[PDB]
Amino acid sequence: MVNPTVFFDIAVDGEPLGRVSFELFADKVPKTAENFRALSTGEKGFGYKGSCFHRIIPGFMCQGGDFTRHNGTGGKSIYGEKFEDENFILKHTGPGILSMANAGPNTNGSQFFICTAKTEWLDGKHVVFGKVKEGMNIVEAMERFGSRNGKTSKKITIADCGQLE
Numbered sequence: 001m002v003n004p005t006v007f008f009d010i011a012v013d014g015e016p017l018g019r020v021s022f023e024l025f026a027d028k029v030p031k032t033a034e035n036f037r038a039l040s041t042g043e044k045g046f047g048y049k050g051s052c053f054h055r056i057i058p059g060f061m062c063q064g065g066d067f068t069r070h071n072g073t074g075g076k077s078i079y080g081e082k083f084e085d086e087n088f089i090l091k092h093t094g095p096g097i098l099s100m101a102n103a104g105p106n107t108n109g110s111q112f113f114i115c116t117a118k119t120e121w122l123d124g125k126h127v128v129f130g131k132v133k134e135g136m137n138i139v140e141a142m143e144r145f146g147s148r149n150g151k152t153s154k155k156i157t158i159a160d161c162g163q164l165e
């Protein structure tokens with residue numbers, strides 16, 4: 001009836017940077033929304049707290065949520081290792097879009113990316129499920145620690161996370 005809101009408190013080499021919050025589009029993509037919500041609260045016994053943004057590419061996107069292998073090869077959903085693409089109603093319209101990373105059709109786990117540009121060519125293959133609500137300036141700050149090949153110049157971590165309200 002109202003979409004939930006979750007936050008991440010970001011750190012750079014252990015030092016506090018700021019907080020980003022996200023509206024999750026539970027109205028349109030409820031299953032995909034609930035996965036990210038629950039990984040953010042940690043209520044299933046695992047999740048995003050302490051994990052890193054392993055791949056950041058300025059002018060493209062910030063990617064993380066690989067909490068098992070910390071490098072883009074791991075993660076798992078609250079539903080099993082993988083779950084299906086729920087739908088593609090929502091599109092990659094611009095900076096701040098929150099979207100699922102994947103390795104093929106119906107291979108969603110826990111990895112996600114926040115867009116820092118319009119990424120139209122991802123439409124219909126990555127499930128869009130939320131957007132940055134507060135702290136797009138902190139996402140832009142994060143982005144400056146990326147590189148063309150995605151390697152970060154300092155360690156970008158989710159020091160804390162959970163649900164607002």
Ligand SMILES: CCOC(=O)CNC(=O)N(Cc1ccc(N)cc1)Cc1nnn(C)n1
Pocket residue numbers: 055061063071072073074075100101102103107108109110111113
């Ligand atoms: C713009 C979003 O791009 C993608 O989702 C494409 N694949 C990955 O990023 N994966 C592959 C992948 C993604 C999700 C899951 N669940 C498994 C594998 C993770 C990754 N990160 N850095 N590298 C080199 N690969």
